[PDB]
């Protein structure tokens, strides 16, 4: 099976899982530590920000690749925003600092 680009889960904008729904593979925490050991921080950031979560970043990246430019455009993962909202629902003030 091979996914490339396709549908996204509505809740967290992450790609689906499962071949039947044409979903991508899962880059679990084991692989996160694997990259962590080697270093390769740029590859990990690319993974997390563009290929998985940041809608704006992945869109800009897609345009870049179509144009032949291969420059990273980092962005805040939407899953983290989800977490921020969920904690904010608990009755807890959580916010970014030095904004």
């Amino acid at each position: 099976h091979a996914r490339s680009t396709g549908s996204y889960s509505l809740v967290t904008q992450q790609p689906l899982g499962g071949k039947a729904q044409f979903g991508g593979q899962r880059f679990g925490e084991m692989e996160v530590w694997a990259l962590e050991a080697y270093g390769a921080a740029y590859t990990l950031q690319e993974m997390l920000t563009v290929k998985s979560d940041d809608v704006n970043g992945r869109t800009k990246m897609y345009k870049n690749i179509v144009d032949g430019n291969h420059q990273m455009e980092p962005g805040m993962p939407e899953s983290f925003n989800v977490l921020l909202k969920e904690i904010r629902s608990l009755g807890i003030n959580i916010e970014l600092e030095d904004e």
């Binding site: 270093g39 740029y42 032949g68 430019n69 291969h70 420059q71």
Partner: protein, 90 residues
Amino acid sequence: ARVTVQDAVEKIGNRFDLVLVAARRARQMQVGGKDPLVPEENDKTTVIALREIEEGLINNQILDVRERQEQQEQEAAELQAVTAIAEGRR
């Protein structure tokens, strides 16, 4: 073809600064349309970006001095254009 990069790592010393400097060189290669300082033999931009490091003609210091001379030469060209415009207006 490039089977291993250990020679380039020796040239730069630390692998991380190597990859950063090579990334900068390749990025200015791909989008800036610059010139390859070594015969490319139809290789991709990334590998020739490593090869110029392998030659040793380029590192962080030379990259910095080249970028700095480029930018101040652009500044001087802009100043010359402004001077020519002022002379035409005067």
